[PDB]
Design an enzyme around this catalytic site. Structure first.
Site, PDB file in Angstrom:
ATOM      1  N   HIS A   1      44.754 -20.687 -37.517  1.00 13.17           N
ATOM      2  CA  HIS A   1      43.855 -21.790 -37.176  1.00 13.17           C
ATOM      3  C   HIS A   1      42.997 -22.260 -38.342  1.00 13.17           C
ATOM      4  O   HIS A   1      42.416 -23.356 -38.266  1.00 13.17           O
ATOM      5  CB  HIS A   1      42.979 -21.347 -35.997  1.00 13.17           C
ATOM      6  CG  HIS A   1      42.284 -22.461 -35.290  1.00 13.17           C
ATOM      7  ND1 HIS A   1      41.037 -22.916 -35.676  1.00 13.17           N
ATOM      8  CD2 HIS A   1      42.677 -23.256 -34.263  1.00 13.17           C
ATOM      9  CE1 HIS A   1      40.675 -23.919 -34.889  1.00 13.17           C
ATOM     10  NE2 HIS A   1      41.658 -24.152 -34.035  1.00 13.17           N
TER      11      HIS A   1
ATOM     12  N   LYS B   1      41.378 -23.832 -41.646  1.00 11.71           N
ATOM     13  CA  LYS B   1      41.536 -25.065 -42.417  1.00 11.71           C
ATOM     14  C   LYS B   1      40.749 -24.916 -43.715  1.00 11.71           C
ATOM     15  O   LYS B   1      39.512 -24.883 -43.681  1.00 11.71           O
ATOM     16  CB  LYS B   1      41.029 -26.290 -41.646  1.00 11.71           C
ATOM     17  CG  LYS B   1      41.473 -26.405 -40.164  1.00 11.71           C
ATOM     18  CD  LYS B   1      40.435 -25.743 -39.268  1.00 11.71           C
ATOM     19  CE  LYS B   1      40.539 -26.233 -37.836  1.00 11.71           C
ATOM     20  NZ  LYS B   1      41.850 -25.862 -37.216  1.00 11.71           N
TER      21      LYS B   1
ATOM     22  N   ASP C   1      42.724 -26.093 -57.947  1.00 10.34           N
ATOM     23  CA  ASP C   1      42.610 -25.694 -59.350  1.00 10.34           C
ATOM     24  C   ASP C   1      41.798 -24.407 -59.522  1.00 10.34           C
ATOM     25  O   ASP C   1      41.167 -24.199 -60.555  1.00 10.34           O
ATOM     26  CB  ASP C   1      42.001 -26.822 -60.190  1.00 10.34           C
ATOM     27  CG  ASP C   1      42.984 -27.953 -60.446  1.00 10.34           C
ATOM     28  OD1 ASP C   1      44.190 -27.773 -60.181  1.00 10.34           O
ATOM     29  OD2 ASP C   1      42.557 -29.022 -60.928  1.00 10.34           O
TER      30      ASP C   1
ATOM     31  N   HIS D   1      34.396 -31.906 -33.386  1.00  7.93           N
ATOM     32  CA  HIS D   1      35.125 -30.722 -33.824  1.00  7.93           C
ATOM     33  C   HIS D   1      34.293 -29.713 -34.591  1.00  7.93           C
ATOM     34  O   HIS D   1      34.822 -28.663 -34.970  1.00  7.93           O
ATOM     35  CB  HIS D   1      36.289 -31.151 -34.702  1.00  7.93           C
ATOM     36  CG  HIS D   1      37.541 -31.348 -33.942  1.00  7.93           C
ATOM     37  ND1 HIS D   1      38.448 -30.334 -33.758  1.00  7.93           N
ATOM     38  CD2 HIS D   1      38.014 -32.416 -33.261  1.00  7.93           C
ATOM     39  CE1 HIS D   1      39.440 -30.775 -33.013  1.00  7.93           C
ATOM     40  NE2 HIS D   1      39.205 -32.036 -32.702  1.00  7.93           N
TER      41      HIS D   1
END
Ligand SMILES: *[C@@H]1O[C@H](CO)[C@@H](O[C@@H]2O[C@H](CO)[C@@H](O[C@H]3O[C@H](CO[C@H]4O[C@H](CO[C@H]5O[C@H](CO)[C@@H](O)[C@H](O)[C@@H]5O)[C@@H](O)[C@H](O)[C@@H]4O)[C@@H](O)[C@H](O[C@H]4O[C@H](CO)[C@@H](O)[C@H](O)[C@@H]4O)[C@@H]3O)[C@H](O)[C@H]2NC(C)=O)[C@H](O)[C@H]1NC(C)=O
Ligand SMILES: *[C@@H]1O[C@H](CO)[C@@H](O[C@@H]2O[C@H](CO)[C@@H](O[C@H]3O[C@H](CO[C@H]4O[C@H](CO[C@H]5O[C@H](CO)[C@@H](O)[C@H](O)[C@@H]5O)[C@@H](O)[C@H](O)[C@@H]4O)[C@@H](O)[C@H](O[C@H]4O[C@H](CO)[C@@H](O)[C@H](O)[C@@H]4O)[C@@H]3O)[C@H](O)[C@H]2NC(C)=O)[C@H](O)[C@H]1NC(C)=O
Ligand SMILES: *[C@@H]1O[C@H](CO)[C@@H](O[C@@H]2O[C@H](CO)[C@@H](O)[C@H](O)[C@H]2NC(C)=O)[C@H](O)[C@H]1NC(C)=O
Ligand SMILES: *[C@@H]1O[C@H](CO)[C@@H](O[C@@H]2O[C@H](CO)[C@@H](O)[C@H](O)[C@H]2NC(C)=O)[C@H](O)[C@H]1NC(C)=O
Ligand SMILES: [Mg+2]
Ligand SMILES: [Mg+2]
Ligand SMILES: [Mn+2]
Ligand SMILES: [Mn+2]
Lengths: 420, 419
Positions: free
Chosen positions: B128, B130, B135, B343
């Site tokens: 789940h 994110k 770099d 969210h």
């Protein structure tokens, strides 16, 4: 593995005190007064009493109430026991401060032995337990104190176990710890001697013949420092009944608060609370909590009871309900100190009986003395169903009220209801 | 025995997605879209993405929405990185059943590496998390999925930490566990090799220079089987923030449920619930829980939220309050699948910042992958006060509603209101 069973013909009788003017239009139990008088009249060799305080007379309470006569008669009969050869031992909680002890003085002069237990010093608790052991054969365990108000002006629930020597002797082991600790110089032993130990506990209850059919019984005690090897703690015994229920949990208890009431800073104590939430959510158990309410109720109780009542949901099958039991009072009864409240402390499920001495907040299980009787018994129509019928009688009565009830309508002061 | 401090000029920026139509009068962060495009434009050597799913285009969602164009541009720019020499590694949760993967096929064709992680097999959870690590220097952590709807049609909250290589390399260690487990034949190792371990945790956080002043930062991860030696579990980090609060706890999370959800037998899970009850009762902490609501909200949340709301009492100084944040949707907006909801998943107190990827129910801390950033920083202002300001904007807005609000009156379907 399993301990020896008991061969005695044990018989249990629920006994109540019903305050003057409290009417239930339906079966009847022997009264606390009647049961105590019978125990006293038949005592021939010994009587042990664990007690919280003694106010058996009008003079004790500075009242002139006719309804104190029953407690005064109890004290009169108690005074006859030592002169007729009964060995009387009374353990009593040390009072918070200076206080006369007219009842205990009278009993000492009759020949009874009395020891005050300083639970404050020993565990920061108090000796809250109420029980009698008579001739190492019968016992009373329940909510009633050594108090004339406990007979006629406060509602009480207890049990008398008759003809059940194995269990009476087991209960005496709990008394003996109070008796030891009531002596000058006493301290909590790091290890209790083996003669305090018991084989009869949650893991292996006592096999008894209870009203002619097999049953499993044991006695739990508090606080932990008084627990010898083998003795189930009161909290563990209580939570085991909650965790094992699969259909319903009915609790009637004067005070319920998921906190360590008297400790600073104040401490949250969710042991029982989470047990009840787990039962209703994980297992669909129907929880009914009947809490008492009077002028002395801790008002912080209300938010915690509303918090439990909010867990009612048709789709999860979560189903906790709360009602407040209020004993009405007229003008004369309102003038009696510390009276007109429902003092019961018990729990019954579809499979188990729990009858206790302690209210349901954390200090009763960690610091204060208490005792509970735990029974399971296959079949219908026994002690368990009798205690369930008492609960439902009270729950359905006009004295039980939802938490949204107007406080001005219930017939006695009640701090846990709003003016709305 | 304290670990080495970081010398990088770390700079944190809160980034949000504000759905079309959601107005806050006079309240100014770069959008998720803008921040992601900036990271992509500057990327010169590596991009790691932990992801739940990919729906960056209209065709992915079977829609014809003009507001999908920002997600489509993100995908177009992602496709330019591998041809220009950037090492792109994408870890993605294995879907429940067969699903097309148009986005990841396009990224594979451009030269990116893609691995699917079967968290269901490994831990009975899903991947789940994110985040992006760019770099080995910058990272994005927050609520936004690789979803065009996460830019224009769902409210999101995340952070981009720039110029912060020590912490970016620390986050890559969490990514490397996803990357390893996405290989055919993988299994959870009984002990993770030492190169997965970290020195920076709740007991000894990383000393960083954050926007020019000292701060303490660390990264927590879930679930326990993916935790190597030294890595604080997400739940422990979260509860630590709750337990250390002495004034307020502000939580904005899409879903809150004190259960191990969809477990049968159902399982009660009071870890966070009891931490909040303990905070308000023992310490007088003011708790504000801003839970989202939409037509997909699990209706059993309502009873548990009401149960917390009941713990408001003038004299105990217990003070928990709950509101529901509802993003309005007209009939056109409501035709977009799985949109028009808030969210965010974060917590802020008077002394600490917590920014996470997980909703607040038990499976997210026992079985499912997630990551959170924990920051403390002496001083007024800063990241902490910026996140508090966002919370109060939302809390005070006309989109936040008491639990006794009519379900007719919140601008969208809401299953947690009685009507
Ligand atoms: C396990 O075994 C034990 C032991 O056998 C069982 O306990 C027995 O349970 C019996 C119930 O079936 C119980 O029977 C009595 O219960 C009540 C108690 O009666 C007492 O009080 C009466 C009223 O007293 C008031 O009134 C008098 C004058 O009116 C006043 O002086 C007084 O101050 C009070 O105000 C007395 O009249 C009795 O003599 C006694 O002292 C009574 O209600 C019962 O009587 C009536 O009960 C039914 C329904 O209530 C009536 O319809 C009917 O007409 C009866 O007359 C009854 O006397 C036993 O007392 C009890 N034994 C012991 C030793 O306590 C357990 O039940 C068993 N458990 C199981 C089987 O599960
Ligand atoms: C730690 O350090 C970091 C690193 O510096 C700090 O982050 C910086 O914070 C700055 C806040 O002062 C921030 O500055 C800008 O913030 C806003 C974002 O600007 C961007 O978006 C604008 C939006 O324009 C679009 O709007 C619509 C929306 O529907 C779009 O559809 C459309 O495309 C429009 O083009 C762009 O116009 C900008 O070009 C930019 O891309 C802006 O609102 C701010 O502008 C306002 O303020 C300035 C002066 O303050 C005025 O001159 C101006 O007129 C506006 O009123 C402002 O430019 C930095 O972007 C941000 N840096 C990075 C790299 O993100 C942290 O804040 C710091 N933390 C702490 C605690 O100190
Ligand atoms: C406890 O046991 C005694 C026996 O020791 C029971 O008393 C007997 O009761 C039966 C039935 O009522 C009579 O036939 C006997 O005459 C009684 N004997 C004596 C010595 O009293 C008593 O009933 C039992 N108590 C309970 C509550 O069951
Ligand atoms: C991240 O690091 C780069 C490299 O130092 C920073 O970019 C410089 O910022 C200064 C100050 O505004 C400019 O004068 C330079 O021209 C920039 N150099 C390059 C190569 O871009 C950057 O500001 C740092 N912080 C952020 C948020 O990106
Ligand atoms: Mg105990
Ligand atoms: Mg965890
Ligand atoms: Mn049981
Ligand atoms: Mn903290």
């Amino acid at each position: 593995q399993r301990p020896a069973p008991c061969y005695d013909p044990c018989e249990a009788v629920l006994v109540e005190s019903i305050p003057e003017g409290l009417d239930f239009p339906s079966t009847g139990n022997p009264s606390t007064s009647q049961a105590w008088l019978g125990l006293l009249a038949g005592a021939h060799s010994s009587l042990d009493i664990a007690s919280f305080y003694w106010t058996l007379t009008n003079n004790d309470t500075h009242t002139q109430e006719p309804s104190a006569q029953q407690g005064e008669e109890v004290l009169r009969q108690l005074q006859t026991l030592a002169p007729k050869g009964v060995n009387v031992r009374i353990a009593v909680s040390k009072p918070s401060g200076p206080q006369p002890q007219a009842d205990l003085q009278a009993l000492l002069q009759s020949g009874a032995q009395v020891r005050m237990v300083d639970m404050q010093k020993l565990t920061h608790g108090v000796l809250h337990t109420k029980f009698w052991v008579v001739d190492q054969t019968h016992f009373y365990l329940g909510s009633a104190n050594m108090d004339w108000r406990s007979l006629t002006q406060v509602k009480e629930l207890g049990v008398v176990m008759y003809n059940c020597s194995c269990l009476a002797r087991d209960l005496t082991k709990i008394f003996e710890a109070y008796w030891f600790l009531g002596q000058a110089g006493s301290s909590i032993p790091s290890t209790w001697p083996r003669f305090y130990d018991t084989r009869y506990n949650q893991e292996t209850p006592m096999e008894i013949c209870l009203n002619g059919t097999p049953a499993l019984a044991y006695l739990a005690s508090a606080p932990p420092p008084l627990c010898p090897s083998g003795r189930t703690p009161d909290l563990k015994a209580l939570l085991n009944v909650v965790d094992n229920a699969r259909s319903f949990i009915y609790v009637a208890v004067m005070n319920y608060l998921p906190t360590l009431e008297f400790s600073h800073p104040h401490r949250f104590w969710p042991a029982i609370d989470d047990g009840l939430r787990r039962a209703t959510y994980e297992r669909g158990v129907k929880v009914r909590l009947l809490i008492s309410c009077w002028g002395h109720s801790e008002p912080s109780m209300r938010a915690f009871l509303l918090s439990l009542a909010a867990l009612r949901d048709n789709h999860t099958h979560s189903d906790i309900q709360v009602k407040l039991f209020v004993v009405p009072a007229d003008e004369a009864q309102a003038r009696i100190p510390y009276a007109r409240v429902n003092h019961n402390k018990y729990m019954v499920t579809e499979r188990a009986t729990y009858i206790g001495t302690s209210n349901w907040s954390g200090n009763y299980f960690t610091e204060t003395a208490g005792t509970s009787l735990l029974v399971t018994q296959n079949g219908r129509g026994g002690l368990r169903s009798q205690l369930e019928a008492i609960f439902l009688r009270d729950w359905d009565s006009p004295y039980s009220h939802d938490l949204d009830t107007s406080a001005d309508s219930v017939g006695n002061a009640c701090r846990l209801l709003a003016a709305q």
